[PDB]
Write a protein that holds these residues in place. Structure first.
Motif, short mmCIF file in Angstrom:
data_model
loop_
_atom_site.label_atom_id
_atom_site.label_comp_id
_atom_site.label_asym_id
_atom_site.label_seq_id
_atom_site.Cartn_x
_atom_site.Cartn_y
_atom_site.Cartn_z
N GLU A 20 13.97 -24.08 22.43
CA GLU A 20 15.71 -24.11 22.48
C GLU A 20 15.01 -25.65 23.93
O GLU A 20 15.88 -26.54 24.03
CB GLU A 20 15.99 -23.35 23.65
CG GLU A 20 16.92 -22.24 22.20
CD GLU A 20 17.41 -21.24 22.34
OE1 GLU A 20 17.31 -21.20 24.00
OE2 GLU A 20 17.95 -20.18 21.34
N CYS A 21 13.82 -25.47 23.94
CA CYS A 21 13.88 -27.45 25.06
C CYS A 21 12.52 -27.95 25.19
O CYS A 21 11.52 -26.74 24.63
CB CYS A 21 15.00 -27.24 26.44
SG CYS A 21 13.35 -25.26 27.35
N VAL A 22 12.13 -28.49 25.74
CA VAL A 22 10.94 -29.01 26.24
C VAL A 22 10.22 -29.63 27.51
O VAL A 22 11.61 -29.65 27.80
CB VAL A 22 10.72 -30.36 24.69
CG1 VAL A 22 11.09 -31.20 25.41
CG2 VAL A 22 9.00 -30.75 24.56
N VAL A 23 8.99 -29.54 27.99
CA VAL A 23 8.97 -29.74 29.18
C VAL A 23 7.63 -30.79 28.31
O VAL A 23 7.14 -30.70 27.55
CB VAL A 23 7.74 -28.72 29.51
CG1 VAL A 23 7.24 -29.48 30.76
CG2 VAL A 23 8.31 -27.49 30.13
N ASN A 24 8.53 -32.21 29.12
CA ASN A 24 7.54 -33.65 29.37
C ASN A 24 6.46 -33.92 30.53
O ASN A 24 6.52 -33.39 31.73
CB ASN A 24 8.01 -34.36 29.34
CG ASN A 24 7.94 -35.90 28.86
OD1 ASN A 24 7.33 -36.03 28.30
ND2 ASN A 24 8.27 -37.40 29.38
N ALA A 25 5.33 -33.89 30.23
CA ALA A 25 4.23 -34.00 31.07
C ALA A 25 4.36 -35.42 31.60
O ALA A 25 3.69 -36.72 30.66
CB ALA A 25 2.80 -34.31 29.63
N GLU A 46 16.41 -40.84 25.20
CA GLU A 46 17.77 -40.78 25.65
C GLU A 46 18.04 -39.83 26.93
O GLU A 46 18.05 -40.22 28.15
CB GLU A 46 19.42 -40.36 25.07
CG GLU A 46 19.87 -40.94 23.68
CD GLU A 46 18.95 -40.89 22.40
OE1 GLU A 46 17.46 -40.14 22.67
OE2 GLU A 46 19.78 -41.46 21.80
N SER A 47 16.59 -39.56 27.11
CA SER A 47 16.80 -37.51 28.65
C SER A 47 15.51 -39.05 29.15
O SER A 47 15.51 -38.13 30.57
CB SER A 47 15.34 -37.12 27.42
OG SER A 47 14.52 -37.51 27.28
N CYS A 63 19.30 -34.17 26.15
CA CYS A 63 19.49 -35.30 25.10
C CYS A 63 20.30 -34.75 24.37
O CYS A 63 19.85 -33.75 23.54
CB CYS A 63 18.18 -35.99 24.01
SG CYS A 63 18.06 -36.50 22.80
N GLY A 64 21.80 -35.81 24.34
CA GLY A 64 22.59 -34.30 23.38
C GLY A 64 22.55 -33.29 23.95
O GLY A 64 23.41 -33.45 26.26
N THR A 65 22.58 -32.13 23.90
CA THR A 65 22.66 -30.53 24.08
C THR A 65 20.91 -30.08 24.29
O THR A 65 20.64 -29.00 25.18
CB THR A 65 24.04 -29.47 23.80
OG1 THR A 65 22.71 -29.07 22.37
CG2 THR A 65 24.89 -30.14 23.40
N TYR A 66 20.03 -31.11 24.08
CA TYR A 66 18.68 -30.98 23.72
C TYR A 66 18.34 -30.70 25.52
O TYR A 66 18.45 -32.90 25.37
CB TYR A 66 17.44 -31.41 22.91
CG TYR A 66 16.91 -30.61 22.47
CD1 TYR A 66 15.98 -29.56 21.65
CD2 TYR A 66 15.85 -31.14 23.68
CE1 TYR A 66 15.10 -29.08 21.09
CE2 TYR A 66 14.29 -30.68 22.93
CZ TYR A 66 14.63 -29.24 22.24
OH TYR A 66 12.73 -28.77 22.18
N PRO A 67 17.50 -29.91 25.69
CA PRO A 67 17.13 -30.15 27.64
C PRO A 67 15.36 -30.57 26.97
O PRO A 67 14.98 -30.47 26.72
CB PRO A 67 16.87 -29.32 28.23
CG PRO A 67 18.47 -28.05 27.49
CD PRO A 67 17.82 -28.52 26.46
N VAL A 68 15.48 -31.52 27.76
CA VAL A 68 14.10 -32.36 28.23
C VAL A 68 13.33 -32.10 29.93
O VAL A 68 14.59 -32.45 30.97
CB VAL A 68 13.93 -33.67 27.99
CG1 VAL A 68 12.73 -34.56 28.15
CG2 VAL A 68 14.05 -33.98 26.39
N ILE A 69 13.03 -31.31 29.85
CA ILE A 69 12.22 -30.55 31.22
C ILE A 69 11.06 -32.25 32.01
O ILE A 69 9.95 -31.29 31.10
CB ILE A 69 11.79 -29.33 31.69
CG1 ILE A 69 13.27 -28.57 30.84
CG2 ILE A 69 11.55 -28.92 32.78
CD1 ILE A 69 12.60 -27.10 31.16
N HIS A 70 11.39 -33.22 32.55
CA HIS A 70 10.79 -33.86 32.99
C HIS A 70 9.58 -33.41 34.43
O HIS A 70 9.91 -33.21 35.24
CB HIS A 70 11.01 -35.21 33.42
CG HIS A 70 11.56 -36.18 32.14
ND1 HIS A 70 11.26 -36.56 30.99
CD2 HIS A 70 13.27 -35.58 31.93
CE1 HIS A 70 11.66 -37.20 30.22
NE2 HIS A 70 12.86 -37.00 30.52
#
Ligand SMILES: [Cl-]
Ligand SMILES: [Cl-]
Ligand SMILES: [Cl-]
Length: 163
Positions: A20-25, A46-47, A63-70
């Motif tokens: 339901e969400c992603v963590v970016n390195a 977009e994130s 990104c839209g409603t999709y959370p990207v956790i940087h």
């Protein structure tokens, strides 16, 4: 929360995750970067609007409603082993706060500081143990993404060890 919160590991591109969400390195400057960060930039560009954040922190951008956790792990080329270890633990604690705040039931997460920020060292165990320290108190399903076949086996073993 997940009904029976779990850890899993998959050997595939985190840009193809089923969570339901992603963590970016991430890097501290919100730049497209290399490795996981470049895959994340291609999938969720977009994130990266105002995603810059200091080392040892996490900043979420939708990104839209999709959370990207940087999440910005330390680059062990620049940090001492001691200070880097402190910042790497801190980045994962901020990921756990964000995952909790977002109310997601699942999260896709890479091992921070294990690629181009590893300072040429094997940090599977160091990075995974800091991941566990932070995420163990969360009730999200955690799915760890890796690219190496031997790393998949070692991460799977570490998960299964705790049962
Ligand atoms: Cl893949
Ligand atoms: Cl890295
Ligand atoms: Cl890997």
């Amino acid at each position: 929360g997940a009904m029976a919160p779990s850890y899993r590991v998959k050997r595939m591109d985190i840009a193809k995750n089923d969570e339901e969400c992603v963590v970016n390195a991430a890097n501290p400057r919100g730049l497209p970067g290399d490795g996981v960060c470049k895959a994340v930039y291609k999938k969720w560009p977009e994130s990266f609007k105002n995603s810059a954040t200091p080392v040892g922190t996490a900043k979420t951008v939708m990104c839209g409603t999709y959370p990207v956790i940087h999440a910005v792990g330390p680059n062990f080329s620049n940090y001492t082993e001691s200070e880097g270890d402190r910042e790497l633990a801190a980045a994962y604690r901020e990921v756990a706060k964000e995952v909790t705040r977002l109310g997601v039931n699942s999260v896709a997460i890479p091992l921070l500081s294990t690629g181009v920020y590893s300072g040429g060292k094997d940090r599977l165990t160091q990075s995974l143990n800091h991941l566990f320290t932070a995420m163990d108190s969360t009730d999200a399903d955690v799915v760890i993404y890796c690219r190496d076949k031997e790393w998949e086996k070692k991460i799977s073993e570490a998960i299964q060890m705790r049962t």
